[PDB]
Design a protein around this ligand. Structure first.
Ligand code: NAP
Ligand code: FOL
Length: 159
C-alpha cells in the first residue's frame, strides 16, 4: 500500500521559497521513524531541498529530465515510480505539493503532523475530506525548549 507523510501548518501550507520558520526536531524524528527501511518517493524539487540521499531508504526521484545523481533512482512517471518500488509492504511518498497531489487518490494511509503555525506559503498539501478517513492515532505535543511550536501527530486510514 501507499502512504503519504507530510508536516502542515495552518491552511495546509507545506512549503515556501525560503526555509520554514520553525524548528521541529521531534517531527523530524517521527519522519525518520516512519520511513526507515522503506522506499520513499519524492519530486525533484524536494530532492534538491533535501540535498543528499536519505540513508537507510530506497530513494526514488520523479523528474521529467535525466537524473543527475546515480546514488538514487530517477523515474519519469507515477507508474514508473510505483514499479521501481518493487514488492514492498508500504511505499512512502514524501512530497512535494505536485507529488502529493498525484498520489493522494491512490493512498490508503496519511501520516500528518499538524503544526500550530501561520506562515505564508506557496505550496499546500491537497485538500482532503475528513469523513473519508479514519483517525487511527493522534498525539498532541506542546512546544518546548527544542521544538518551536506545538504540534500534533495523526495517522489517518482511508475508509
Ligand atoms: N512540510 C512538508 O511536509 C513537505 C514535504 C515535501 C516537500 N515540502 C516542500 O514542497 C516544495 C516542493 O513541492 P513542489 O510542488 O514545488 O515540488 P515537488 O513536488 O517536490 O517536485 C516537483 C517536480 O517533480 C517532478 N515531477 C512531479 N510529478 C512528475 C511526474 N508525474 N512526472 C515527472 N516528473 C514529475 C518534476 O520535476 P522536473 O521539474 O525535473 O520535471 C516537478 O517539477 C518545497 O518548498 C519543499 O520544502 C514540504
Ligand atoms: N513529518 C514530516 N516532516 C517533514 O519535515 C517532512 N519533510 C519532507 C521533505 N523534507 C525533508 C527534509 C529533511 C529531511 C531529513 O533530513 N531527514 C533526515 C532526518 C535526520 C534527522 O532526524 O534530522 C532523515 O533521515 O529522515 C527529510 C525530509 C517530507 N515529509 C515531511 N514529513
Amino acid at each position: 500500500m501507499i502512504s503519504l507523510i507530510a508536516a502542515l501548518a495552518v491552511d495546509r501550507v507545506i512549503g515556501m521559497e525560503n526555509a520554514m520558520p520553525w524548528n521541529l526536531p521531534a517531527d523530524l524524528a517521527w519522519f525518520k521513524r516512519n520511513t526507515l527501511d522503506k522506499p520513499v518517493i519524492m519530486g525533484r524539487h524536494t530532492w534538491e531541498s533535501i540535498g543528499r540521499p536519505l540513508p537507510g531508504r530506497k530513494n526514488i526521484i520523479l523528474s521529467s529530465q535525466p537524473g543527475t545523481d546515480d546514488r538514487v533512482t530517477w523515474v519519469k512517471s507515477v507508474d514508473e515510480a510505483i514499479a521501481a518500488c518493487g514488492d514492498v509492504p508500504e511505499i512512502m511518498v514524501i512530497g512535494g505539493g505536485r507529488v502529493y497531489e498525484q498520489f493522494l487518490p491512490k493512498a490508503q494511509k496519511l501520516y500528518l503532523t499538524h503544526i500550530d503555525a501561520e506562515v505564508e506559503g506557496d505550496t499546500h498539501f491537497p485538500d482532503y475530506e475528513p469523513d473519508d478517513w479514519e483517525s487511527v492515532f493522534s498525539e498532541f505535543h506542546d512546544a518546548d525548549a527544542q521544538n518551536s511550536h506545538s504540534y500534533c501527530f495523526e495517522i489517518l486510514e482511508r475508509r
